[PDB]
């Protein structure tokens, strides 16, 4: 004999209470400017905290965090469609357009002291070559990728890294155990390029296994599965991805191979074949052709059904657009002279390398009202508390009282000290991180056909 185990209060789809109107609005940013060094930041020598020239390349994530003006602070000419005593107003997204205007062409990087031992494609004879230091200069193309994310919560990532060891055991080899983590994706941090989603800063002592841009960083990677499985669904509205790579060359490492390959698999040789070379091999991704029809931008994106339960409604008046491109990541060179003379010499010039990058944000929104009633206000309150606060209509006693007295003291800390805990709301949890911010509080409009999107929006909507 058994039983239906436990009734649990479920989450519900957001189209149950959110009501839509026939009022639309436009927003649009200006052209964004970004320029810097493709390899590393330029730090000031005297004070080593302020930057001189920042590091930016193609393979850094460009997370965007726009701001939205609160719709309740709008004096409308005809306030008859809603009551501000019983309702409130909040925005929802319906459109998306990301523009890039740089010409195509992939960027490249490298590393001057890369741990190449020998080429392992057609000829590696015996015996071993002499030397204690055999690092070489190599330059290397990257794999290509295209993606896009939108949502109300900033996107949550995941990466490998050094974690906890185990108990003192003499049977487990000196190998750092690998552990999964969950992180919030910052700006500037990198994407995988076929070398695993692990931190290279705390796992590679030699710093000679990747190109120079990704030795001391965490090449994070976006999670789909954990993010799709969030019950509230306020992180992923709508997303695409497209990537490709293939092998170009083959290489081996160099050094004391940490595990001897077992004798059960091979017959050992002699003469010139007494010693054994390495087994630590690694490829190089290069990337392939990039068409104009393999692009995922300069295209409208109409949304009518998100995969999560949030149907585009954005609490807190903020969005989160993250984009990764490599197709316009080309690298220009600069050549300035020191002296002018009529004969070429290799020390009269100086070289700097740079990289440019620009973006375009283009949006259309819809106005939505919430008829706040007693059975509904409890439903948001178990989801969040900040949205109920900044609407400025009420406050909450968090219990209905406690059940234990808990024995509060009164004589102020002179006999048996405890955790005093001076509190602070800290006004957001997101303030520790750093995003490319772009304001839009003076960039709304109601007349559509003076902008490219609303001209296209009127055709697909049939209005």
């Amino acid at each position, epitope marked *: 004999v058994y039983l239906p185990p436990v009734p649990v209060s479920k989450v519900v789809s957001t189209d149950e209470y959110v009501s839509r109107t026939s009022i639309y609005y436009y927003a649009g940013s200006s052209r964004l400017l970004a320029v810097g060094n493709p390899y590393f930041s330029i730090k000031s020598p005297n004070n080593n905290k302020k930057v001189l020239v920042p590091k930016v390349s193609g393979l850094q994530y460009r997370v965007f965090r726009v701001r939205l003006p609160d719709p309740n602070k709008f004096g409308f000419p005809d306030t008859s469609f809603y009551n501000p005593d019983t309702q409130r107003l909040v925005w929802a997204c319906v459109g998306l357009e990301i523009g890039r205007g740089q010409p195509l062409g992939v960027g490249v990087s490298g590393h001057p002291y890369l741990n190449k031992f020998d080429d392992t494609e057609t000829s590696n004879r015996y015996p071993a070559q002499p030397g204690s230091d055999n690092r070489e200069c190599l330059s290397m193309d990257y794999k290509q990728t295209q993606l896009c994310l939108i949502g109300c919560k900033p996107p949550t990532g995941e990466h490998w890294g050094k974690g906890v060891a185990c108990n003192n055991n003499a*049977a*487990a*080899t000196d190998c750092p155990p690998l552990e999964l983590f969950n992180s919030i994706i910052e700006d500037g941090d990198m994407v995988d390029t076929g070398f695993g989603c692990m931190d290279f800063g705390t796992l590679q002592a030699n710093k000679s296994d990747v190109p120079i841009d990704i030795c001391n960083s965490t090449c994070k990677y976006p999670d789909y599965l954990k993010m799709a499985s969030e019950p509230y669904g306020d992180s992923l509205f709508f997303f695409l991805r497209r990537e490709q790579m293939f092998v170009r060359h083959f290489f081996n490492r160099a050094g004391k191979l940490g595990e001897a390959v077992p004798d059960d698999l091979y017959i050992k040789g002699s003469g010139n074949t007494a010693v054994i070379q390495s087994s630590a091999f690694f490829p190089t991704p290069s990337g392939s052709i990039v068409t104009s029809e393999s692009q995922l931008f300069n295209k409208p994106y109409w949304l009518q059904r998100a995969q999560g339960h949030n149907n585009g409604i954005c609490w807190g008046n903020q969005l989160f657009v993250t984009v990764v491109d490599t197709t316009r990541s080309t690298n220009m060179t600069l050549c300035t002279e020191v002296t002018k003379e009529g004969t070429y010499k290799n020390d009269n010039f100086k070289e700097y390398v740079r990289h440019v990058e620009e973006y375009d944000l283009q949006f259309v929104f819809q106005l939505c009202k919430i008829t706040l009633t007693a059975e509904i206000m409890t439903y948001i309150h178990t989801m969040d508390s900040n949205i109920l606060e900044d609407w400025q209509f009420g406050l909450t006693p968090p219990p209905s009282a406690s059940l234990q007295d808990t024995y509060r003291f009164v004589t102020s800390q002179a006999i048996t000290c405890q955790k005093t805990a001076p509190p602070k709301e800290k006004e957001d949890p997101l303030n520790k991180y750093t995003f490319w911010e772009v304001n839009l509080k003076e960039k709304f409009s109601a007349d559509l056909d003076q902008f490219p999107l609303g001209r296209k929006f009127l055709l697909q909507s049939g209005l």
Partner: antibody
Amino acid sequence: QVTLKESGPGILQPSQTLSLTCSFSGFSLSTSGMGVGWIRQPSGKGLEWLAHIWWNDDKNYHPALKSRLTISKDTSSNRVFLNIASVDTADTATYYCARIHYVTDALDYWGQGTSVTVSA
Amino acid sequence: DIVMSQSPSSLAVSVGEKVTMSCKSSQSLLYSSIQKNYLAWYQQKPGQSPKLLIYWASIRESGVPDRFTGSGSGTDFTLTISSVKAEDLAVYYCQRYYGYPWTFGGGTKLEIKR
């Protein structure tokens, strides 16, 4: 095939260093499959495990002591050496060095059983 | 540690008799995935060092005859000998190699009855 003998100082004083040397012939310790321990016994009491060191250079010790007991091998001469510092009156015993398996997970064939008695 | 306790300290057996020698522990020697009992046994002949008998509580060492057999599972264990002879006069020891650190038992002394 496997032959085994130990060698130690024999007579020690309190608060001195103990260098018990173990010697083997018949195998190599860097081979994947060979492994050795170190076991003591007094004349009257039973037996107890002290230290055991494996192929890939990691060490375990008896956690009651955990400080003085430092085991180390020399795979080039194919030997193990036992290094106890500050030998006290409780270490009056007869040590036994031998080779272990892990398909049997026990100590196969043992040696001479060198005697270390410490007094004034 | 996980302690080891053996009983009795000595047992007098005649020639041709079967001896049951019992050793116990405080924690069960079975693993949930390994499914082999983490136990082995020893034989300290007078004037000789201890030698190996049977491993994983049911699998014998090469050279030990069929008269020596190990049993027991969980926490109770007994070494079962079919018919004892002249050569088996010794001191036997219990060994658990399950949890680190490893320890020995109290031990038992076998004598031929006179």
